[PDB]
Amino acid sequence: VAQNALVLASPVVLVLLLSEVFLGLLSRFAPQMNAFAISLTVKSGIAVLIMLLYFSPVLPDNVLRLSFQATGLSSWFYERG
Amino acid sequence: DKDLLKGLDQEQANEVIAVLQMHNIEANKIDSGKLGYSITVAEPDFTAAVYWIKTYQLPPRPRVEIAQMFPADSLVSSPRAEKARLYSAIEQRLEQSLQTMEGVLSARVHISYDIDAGENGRPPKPVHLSALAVYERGSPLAHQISDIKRFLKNSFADVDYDNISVVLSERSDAQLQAPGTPVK
Amino acid sequence: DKDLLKGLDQEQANEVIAVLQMHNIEANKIDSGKLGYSITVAEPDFTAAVYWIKTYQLPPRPRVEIAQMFPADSLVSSPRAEKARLYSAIEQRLEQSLQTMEGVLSARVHISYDIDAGENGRPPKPVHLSALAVYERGSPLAHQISDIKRFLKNSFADVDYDNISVVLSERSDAQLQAPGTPVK
Amino acid sequence: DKDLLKGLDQEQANEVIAVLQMHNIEANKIDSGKLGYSITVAEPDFTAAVYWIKTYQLPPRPRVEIAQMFPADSLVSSPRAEKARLYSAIEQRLEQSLQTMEGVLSARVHISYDIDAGENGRPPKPVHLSALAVYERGSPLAHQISDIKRFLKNSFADVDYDNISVVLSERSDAQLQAPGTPVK
Amino acid sequence: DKDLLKGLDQEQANEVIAVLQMHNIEANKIDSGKLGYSITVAEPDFTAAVYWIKTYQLPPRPRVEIAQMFPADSLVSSPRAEKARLYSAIEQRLEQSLQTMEGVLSARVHISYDIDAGENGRPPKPVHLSALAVYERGSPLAHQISDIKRFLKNSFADVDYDNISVVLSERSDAQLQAPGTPVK
Amino acid sequence: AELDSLLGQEKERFQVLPGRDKMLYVAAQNERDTLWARQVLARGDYDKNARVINENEENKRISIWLDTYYPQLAYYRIHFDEPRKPVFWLSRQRNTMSKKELEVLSQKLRALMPYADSVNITLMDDVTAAGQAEAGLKQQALPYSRRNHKGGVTFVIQGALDDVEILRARQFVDSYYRTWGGRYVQFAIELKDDWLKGRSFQYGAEGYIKMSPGHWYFPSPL
Amino acid sequence: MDDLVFAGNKALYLVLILSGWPTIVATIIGLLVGLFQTVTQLQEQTLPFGIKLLGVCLCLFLLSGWYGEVLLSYGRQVIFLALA
């Protein structure tokens, strides 16, 4: 479930992280910006907006794909006598 | 040398001359480069030419498809906006495939848009079709109405033979002779 | 020396001449390099040529495929647009494999599209096929209809023999003689 | 004298010469460097040569494969996009391995695509096949219909002999002699 | 000297000369350095060479492996994209290990691939094989079937003899004399 | 020059016959070689009159004359193996034409084809036409059904045939059709879905009874 | 099926616009005061919170008559989807 967790949270954590260092390069270009305070105001709108693009066509079919089906019941059990 | 239209297109100019040559008047096409084409007629045939402009609703505007309102380059598309782009692309492909039959000059195909069948838990409705065609003069056009209905019958999931309507007609009489230049 | 179409391209100019040559008029194709081809006709044949443009709807539009409305370069792709991208590529592949049979010059096949069944608890529906063909003449084309339905059945998952409809016709008579220049 | 196609590729150019020599007209292939090839004919054969352009659909399109519309360069890859590229490499390799048989000049094989059986609890369907072939003449082509069925049978998981449909033919009459130059 | 083809590489050119010499015509393999090779024939031989180009589908396409669709340079590789690269390397090893038998000149081996077992809990099915071969002529090729099916049987988990199919044939007749230059 | 040098390299696939109306007829053998010679007369390198005739299209051409001036005529096929003396296979058991009446027909068939010298009329039997059709349909072991009525027979082959039962059938129909033509006996190859290839029974109280051949078939679940 | 993602999208739409105007006024005065801190040498850390506090609450003061209305329309129309 962890490798299903990381690839499902894959696309939204890359843009939020790349935006922070892009903001961090502007703090190196303007020293007293205090971009840590600015990072909290702007990220909650960004972190929700990019996931709206693939919320409709991508999320609900993985839910039906990941439902555990009865055919795999042989691989998890065996009777002992 | 009174002009009546200017700034036209290339497709706009061959249709207006096809209309005016039916009514025994002769027009001239003048290229203006980047500004489009232009059409001038003589002086005594100017009163009659204005009457035929209002009737045919000329010049013709370009034909519209449903997938022109819903472009593919949209950044987010609802599932409501994908089956409308899908049925509009099948009827653009079905129209070119009907033009490769024997005798057909032009054709147009419409599909019934039932897209809200997925809102509730009910099974979807049937799909209805309607087609038009213009055939070559001299053909027994009574026997060619059950063949287009048979070809169109199993291009979908399940249709009936009374959900399809074919309305066809032979073509008009040919116009081959020149109109004739007037004298004053 | 009167133009009727300019700014054309390679595939459209070779189709307008072959249609007009059926109707006994000569034509000269003048290329312009970057601006594409151009077609001029004579002056007595101009009133008849405008009439044959309006019926055949020239110039022809480029042929549309369903996979043109769902490009692979998008950042995200719905599952409806992935089964549509799968089905719209097999539909072109069957066209190039049917042209290698004995006598068929051109053909067009259509497959029934399904959208709603893949998401809900409803079972998938049956699959329907329809084919068109243009055969070389001199062929006994009543016996040529059984190898194609034998070919088309088990190229898919589950179809039957009564959901396929074949409509075929022999090609027209050949045109080999020159139209002829109008002497005056 | 008059040109009819230009800007072709190498394999698109070689197809136009091989069709016209069947119909008793002689053409010339001229190279143009980076602008591809070009094909010219003489003066009286021009009216008939355009007629064979429209029927044979020249220039030929490049052949389409199913792996072209699902490229591997996308960093995401759905399981519907992995079985389609897996099927599309098997249905070209079995056809290319079929060309090493005894007496086969060309072949084309199609496989049934199944993508939506694993996503739900539905069992996978059976797999169907179809094949075409053109044999060299002088062959008893009623006895060569059971080795292609035996080779294609247990190249997959579990098929029956009803799901395999092979229809094959003998080659056409050979074209070997020159057309002849039209003298005037 | 009419030019047929240009730009072929080393392995494509040696197949063109081996096919044309079967039909009494000779060619010249002219090197051009970086632009590959080129093949020219004479003028009376030009009409015949373009007939055998379309029928034999020359130039040959490069042979396809399933491991080309799934590259080993990806960041992460699924288990579906690992058994396809595993099964593709055994079948390339199985036809090179078939050439070290006595009598055999060429071989092609196909394996049935497992697809559904990667995502499902179903147990895998039995694996089916199929092989092609070319034997040096004069050999008692009836008694030669019992060794390849015995060798191919216990190279996997558990197969049976009704699921292995071998269809083999002797090589064609030898071509040992020169065609002869066409004098005219 | 002459026409038999304006053709290809080999003078083996064509035949130039002289006409009575000052024309020159060219005798091809199939459809593909007909456009090879029709292209020559179309491009116009010949200062005289010429025509390209063919066995497939002049057997249908002089049947348009035949069903206007001679209705209710019973005939099979015209064979052009020797194009100066063709053989007209006429029916014996369905015609009433006398000896004097066949001779006006030999001249009125001569007037449509000016290259020929004399048409040889021979009579075939109507029962040896169905004996060759039944033995060939039984030699390939195909399930079929014969429907006799007055003025023609018909053979119907239904069922879910496999790929082998089509290739031996399609190679056989066009070889019987080249001899007789599709005027008297007609084949009815059709594919539907029933593993009982054509036949159909009903079951009651004693066993099975063979039903009459009908258009309706039971579609097969199997 | 199609209505559940459709109810979710406008639910996901409403949080973008209602936090839209408070965050963008809290953005531009966090930057225009920072550029003032560069051209005027000012190294206090707790400056911008005093401008940012009264700046957003006035925008909330000016739009509180707008905020409740899109919520009463959306909540009323989802219950019609719930029963019938």
UniProtKB/Swiss-Prot annotation, chain A:
It is found in: Cell membrane. The chain crosses the membrane at residues 6-26, 35-55. Involved in a secretory pathway responsible for the surface presentation of determinants needed for the entry of Salmonella species into mammalian cells. Belongs to the FliR/MopE/SpaR family. This is Surface presentation of antigens protein SpaR. It comes from Salmonella typhimurium (strain LT2 / SGSC1412 / ATCC 700720). The gene is spaR. The chain holds residues 177 to 257 of 263 of the full protein.
From Swiss-Prot, chains B, C, D, E:
One of its GO terms (cellular component) is cell outer membrane. Belongs to the YscJ lipoprotein family. Its main location: membrane. Required for invasion of epithelial cells. Could be involved in protein secretion. It is found in: Cell outer membrane. GO terms for biological process: protein secretion. It is a lipid-anchor. Keywords: Cell outer membrane, Lipoprotein, Membrane, Palmitate, Protein transport, Signal, Transmembrane, Transmembrane helix, Transport, Virulence. This is Lipoprotein PrgK.
From Swiss-Prot, chain F:
Signal peptide: none annotated. It is found in: Cell membrane. The keyword Metal-binding does not apply. GO terms for cellular component: plasma membrane. It is a single-pass membrane protein. Keywords: Cell membrane, Membrane, Transmembrane, Transmembrane helix, Virulence. It comes from the Bacteria. Its main location: membrane. Disulfide bonds: none annotated. Required for invasion of epithelial cells. This is Protein PrgH. The gene is prgH. The chain holds residues 171 to 392 of 392 of the full protein.
Curated annotation (Swiss-Prot), chain G:
It comes from the Bacteria. Pfam families: Bac_export_3. It is a multi-pass membrane protein. It is found in: Cell membrane. Keywords: Cell membrane, Membrane, Transmembrane, Transmembrane helix, Virulence. GO terms for biological process: bacterial-type flagellum assembly; protein secretion. GO terms for cellular component: plasma membrane. The chain crosses the membrane at residues 16-36, 53-73. Its main location: membrane. InterPro entries: Bac_export_3, T3SS_HrpO. Belongs to the FliQ/MopD/SpaQ family. Involved in a secretory pathway responsible for the surface presentation of determinants needed for the entry of Salmonella species into mammalian cells. This is Surface presentation of antigens protein SpaQ.
